[PDB]
Amino acid sequence: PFAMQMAYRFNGIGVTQNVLYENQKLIANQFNSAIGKIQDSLSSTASAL
Amino acid sequence: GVFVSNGTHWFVTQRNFYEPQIITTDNTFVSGNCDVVIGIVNNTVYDPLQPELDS
Numbered sequence A: 001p002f003a004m005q006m007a008y009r010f011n012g013i014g015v016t017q018n019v020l021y022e023n024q025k026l027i028a029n030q031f032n033s034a035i036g037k038i039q040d041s042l043s044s045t046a047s048a049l
Numbered sequence B: 001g002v003f004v005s006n007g008t009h010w011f012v013t014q015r016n017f018y019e020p021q022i023i024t025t026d027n028t029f030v031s032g033n034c035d036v037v038i039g040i041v042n043n044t045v046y047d048p049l050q051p052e053l054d055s
């Protein structure tokens, strides 16, 4: 399961996995906002490539 | 490692080779309350000195 995969990647950079399980919804919201910002900067800017 | 269930009983194992052990307080660590983890499960954590020492 995907949150268990994210918990052991957090463990790979030296954070304990309870930090992820206790902040799971904040972390998923920050990810969804960052994807939306990538999409806006590609959808209106014309020198990126 | 990871908590796994064989259908009836809960164990802890390493991720790349299957070798199930009893969940004790040397296998695990405590942090926080049971209401902030999505998907937590009710089970017992055995204390490894209560049969060997009650002197």
Ligand SMILES: *[C@@H]1O[C@H](CO)[C@@H](O[C@@H]2O[C@H](CO)[C@@H](O)[C@H](O)[C@H]2NC(C)=O)[C@H](O)[C@H]1NC(C)=O
Pocket (backbone or CB within 6 Å): B006, B007, B008, B009
């Ligand atoms: C899941 O694991 C438990 C724990 O070992 C199994 O229960 C044991 O089964 C053996 C053989 O039938 C018995 O000798 C033990 O006394 C049982 N232990 C306990 C605590 O009851 C259980 O059978 C396993 N289930 C499956 C489907 O493999």
Ligand SMILES: *[C@@H]1O[C@H](CO)[C@@H](O[C@@H]2O[C@H](CO)[C@@H](O)[C@H](O)[C@H]2NC(C)=O)[C@H](O)[C@H]1NC(C)=O
Pocket (backbone or CB within 6 Å): B042
């Ligand atoms: C896991 O165990 C806890 C504690 O025994 C259960 O929490 C209780 O839930 C009932 C209603 O379901 C409440 O009225 C109690 O006040 C709760 N106890 C505590 C100490 O908060 C929980 O329901 C169990 N979960 C499962 C899935 O069995």
Ligand SMILES: *[C@@H]1O[C@H](CO)[C@@H](O)[C@H](O)[C@H]1NC(C)=O
Pocket (backbone or CB within 6 Å): B038, B039
């Ligand atoms: C897994 O999905 C079920 C619905 O099929 C849901 O009830 C359960 O809470 C989910 N568990 C986790 C850990 O998200």
